[PDB]
Design an enzyme around this catalytic site. Structure first.
Site, short mmCIF file in Angstrom:
data_model
loop_
_atom_site.label_atom_id
_atom_site.label_comp_id
_atom_site.label_asym_id
_atom_site.label_seq_id
_atom_site.Cartn_x
_atom_site.Cartn_y
_atom_site.Cartn_z
N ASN A 1 -10.28 -1.02 -2.99
CA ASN A 1 -9.83 -2.39 -3.27
C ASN A 1 -10.34 -3.44 -2.26
OD1 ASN A 1 -6.46 -1.33 -4.26
ND2 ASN A 1 -8.38 -1.22 -5.42
N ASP B 1 -10.63 5.47 -4.41
CA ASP B 1 -9.19 5.23 -4.35
C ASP B 1 -8.88 4.12 -3.34
OD1 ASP B 1 -6.55 5.93 -5.19
OD2 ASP B 1 -6.25 7.24 -3.49
N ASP C 1 -3.64 9.78 -10.52
CA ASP C 1 -2.31 9.22 -10.26
C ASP C 1 -1.41 9.25 -11.49
OD1 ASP C 1 -2.21 8.53 -7.53
OD2 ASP C 1 -3.20 6.63 -7.78
N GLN D 1 -2.85 -6.06 5.82
CA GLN D 1 -4.16 -5.83 5.20
C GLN D 1 -5.23 -5.67 6.27
OE1 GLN D 1 -5.04 -4.86 2.11
NE2 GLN D 1 -2.78 -4.77 2.21
N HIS E 1 0.25 1.64 -9.13
CA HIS E 1 -0.16 2.97 -9.59
C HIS E 1 0.01 3.17 -11.10
CE1 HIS E 1 0.14 3.88 -5.17
NE2 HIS E 1 -1.05 4.36 -5.50
N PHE F 1 -4.77 -2.28 7.68
CA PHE F 1 -5.19 -1.28 6.69
C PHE F 1 -6.71 -1.14 6.76
CE2 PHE F 1 -5.89 -0.37 1.93
CZ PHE F 1 -5.62 0.97 2.04
C1 LIG Z 1 -4.70 -3.37 -1.97
C2 LIG Z 1 -4.13 -3.07 -0.60
O1 LIG Z 1 -3.70 -1.69 -0.57
C3 LIG Z 1 -2.82 -1.26 0.34
O2 LIG Z 1 -2.53 -1.94 1.29
C4 LIG Z 1 -2.52 0.18 0.38
C5 LIG Z 1 -1.79 0.85 1.48
C6 LIG Z 1 -1.40 0.30 2.83
N1 LIG Z 1 -1.77 2.12 1.17
N2 LIG Z 1 -2.28 2.32 -0.15
C7 LIG Z 1 -2.33 3.57 -0.79
C8 LIG Z 1 -3.57 4.17 -1.03
C9 LIG Z 1 -3.63 5.43 -1.64
C10 LIG Z 1 -2.45 6.08 -2.00
C11 LIG Z 1 -1.21 5.49 -1.75
C12 LIG Z 1 -1.14 4.23 -1.13
C13 LIG Z 1 -2.74 1.10 -0.58
C14 LIG Z 1 -3.38 0.88 -1.93
MG LIG Z 2 -2.44 8.98 -5.41
ZN LIG Z 3 -4.78 6.27 -6.42
#
Ligand SMILES: CCOC(=O)c1c(C)[nH+]n(-c2ccccc2)c1C
Ligand SMILES: [Mg+2]
Ligand SMILES: [Zn+2]
EC number: 3.1.4.53
Length: 326
Positions: free
Chosen positions: A236, A233, A116, A284, A75, A287
């Protein structure tokens, strides 16, 4: 210099999904947010449209970027730059052609930039559980997201930082409301409700003969902008694998550090935060299956078929991560 030349070349891909954001961060002396925002503002003619003095924009952006923490692995300013550029590409979706006004476009990009800011590298739940001053200030709801907004707006008051100085009072009021609505929607506790409402919109969807979305009232327009920035957001896993893997390494480092703090405080270690009992690849895949794919498949339905290449990449990456699990 050669560095400035290669940076300019990398920035030529600003309209493309999969921009080399890490390379840009290196080439710009850790100023990816400033250079990417400036590039996007010039590309969309936002300085001329809103009479934003270039020196004011740069001063604000460098100040904003300074308030992202360089010692937070995920972040940080690179993530902000990435969300900004991702939103910028999503705004150019053929199905959204001429749907949003210049003020709404400005609001979406600005919200992405500040979304953020001043993130401490720990979650809302950690802040609530540790009886933090932030959770006390914000009564346990959207603790971080309220803080990101407050900092992003407060910085406009610094010397030569008011990039909105030439907007009308009505334009300023509208932009502020939109930005708050968008950033508050990035709170992950609101993910399920946002998605449910996005699904309802897809089912009652209205389009022209060319497939362009017809959004008349504020409720529908802000809902699409909220989901757009939320998608950015959570973009990724939809990026080229080389980029996605770097993002995964970064969030895991951040999470593990939170877990280290929880362990030494005698707290239960949050999901994915225990470096001694982690399953990165399984996490992952989980997720993607439970959060990212449901959201992106719904977004894809809204703008069909414009997001097909993004969805294809997401599924490719899910297949790869799954293959790393014996
Ligand atoms: C690159 C892989 O990202 C993640 O695994 C995650 C998880 C499990 N939560 N996460 C957030 C997303 C938005 C806000 C806070 C956390 C991310 C980036
Ligand atoms: Mg955030
Ligand atoms: Zn973010």
């Amino acid at each position: 210099t050669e560095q400035e030349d290669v940076l300019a070349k990398e920035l030529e891909d600003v309209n493309k999904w999969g921009l080399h954001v890490f390379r840009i961060a290196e080439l710009s002396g850790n100023r990816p947010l400033t250079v990417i925002m400036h590039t996007i503002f010039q590309e969309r003619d936002l300085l001329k449209t809103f009479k934003i003095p270039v020196d004011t924009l740069i001063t604000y952006l460098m100040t904003l970027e300074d308030h992202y923490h360089a010692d937070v692995a995920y972040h940080n300013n690179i993530h902000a730059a990435d969300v900004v550029q991702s939103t910028h590409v999503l705004l150019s979706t053929p199905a959204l052609e001429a749907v949003f006004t210049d003020l709404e476009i400005l609001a979406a990009i600005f919200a992405s930039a500040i979304h953020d800011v001043d993130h401490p590298g720990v979650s809302n739940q950690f802040l609530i559980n540790t009886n933090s001053e932030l959770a006390l200030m914000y009564n346990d709801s959207s603790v971080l997201e309220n803080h990101h907004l407050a900092v992003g707006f407060k910085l406009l008051q610094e010397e030569n930082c008011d990039i909105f100085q030439n907007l009308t009072k009505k334009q300023r009021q509208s932009l502020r409301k939109m930005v708050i609505d968008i950033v508050l929607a990035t709170d992950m506790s609101k993910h399920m409700n946002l998605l449910a409402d996005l699904k309802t919109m897809v089912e009652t969807k209205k389009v022209t003969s060319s497939g362009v979305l017809l959004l008349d009232n504020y409720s529908d327009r802000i809902q699409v902008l909220q989901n757009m920035v939320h998608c950015a957001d959570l973009s990724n896993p939809t990026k080229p694998l080389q980029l996605y893997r770097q993002w995964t390494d970064r969030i895991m480092e951040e999470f593990f550090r939170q877990g280290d703090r929880e362990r030494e405080r005698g707290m239960e270690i949050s999901p994915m935060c225990d470096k001694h009992n982690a399953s990165v690849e399984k996490s992952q895949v989980g997720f993607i299956d439970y959060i990212v794919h449901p959201l992106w498949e719904t977004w894809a339905d809204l703008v069909h078929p414009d997001a097909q290449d993004i969805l294809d990449t997401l599924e490719d990456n899910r297949e790869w991560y799954q293959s790393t699990i014996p």
